[PDB]
C-alpha cells in the first residue's frame, strides 16, 4: 500500500511540493519525512 507510493512521496518531499501526495500514514514517521523536507530546503 505504501511500498509503491513511497518513492513518489519521498522524492516529492526532497524535490518540490508541486504534486499533491498521499503522505499521512504512520504519523510518527512525519518527523522523518519533515527532516527529509529539511534536506530538500537546504539542498535546493
Amino acid at each position: 500500500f505504501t511500498i509503491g507510493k513511497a518513492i513518489w512521496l519521498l522524492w516529492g518531499l526532497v524535490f518540490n511540493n508541486s504534486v499533491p501526495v498521499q503522505n499521512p500514514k504512520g504519523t510518527t514517521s512525519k518527523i522523518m519525512v519533515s527532516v527529509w523536507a529539511f534536506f530538500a530546503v537546504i539542498f535546493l
Binding site: 511540493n17 503522505n23 504519523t27 535546493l44
Partner: protein, 48 residues
C-alpha cells in the same frame, strides 16, 4: 486541534504538505498567515 495544529505549523516551517486543515476563524487565519509569512521570509533570507 492541539496535535494536528502543531504538526501543520511545523510542516509549514519546512514548506511541507503536512497539515490539511483550514482556519476556523479569521483570527486563526491571520495567525497562521503571519506564521507562514515569517517562515518563508526566513527561508528566503537563508538561501540568500
Amino acid at each position: 486541534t492541539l496535535s494536528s495544529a502543531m504538526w501543520f505549523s511545523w510542516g509549514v516551517l519546512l514548506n511541507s504538505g503536512i497539515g490539511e486543515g483550514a482556519p476556523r476563524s479569521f483570527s486563526a487565519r491571520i495567525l497562521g498567515m503571519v506564521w507562514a509569512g515569517f517562515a518563508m521570509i526566513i527561508v528566503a533570507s537563508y538561501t540568500a
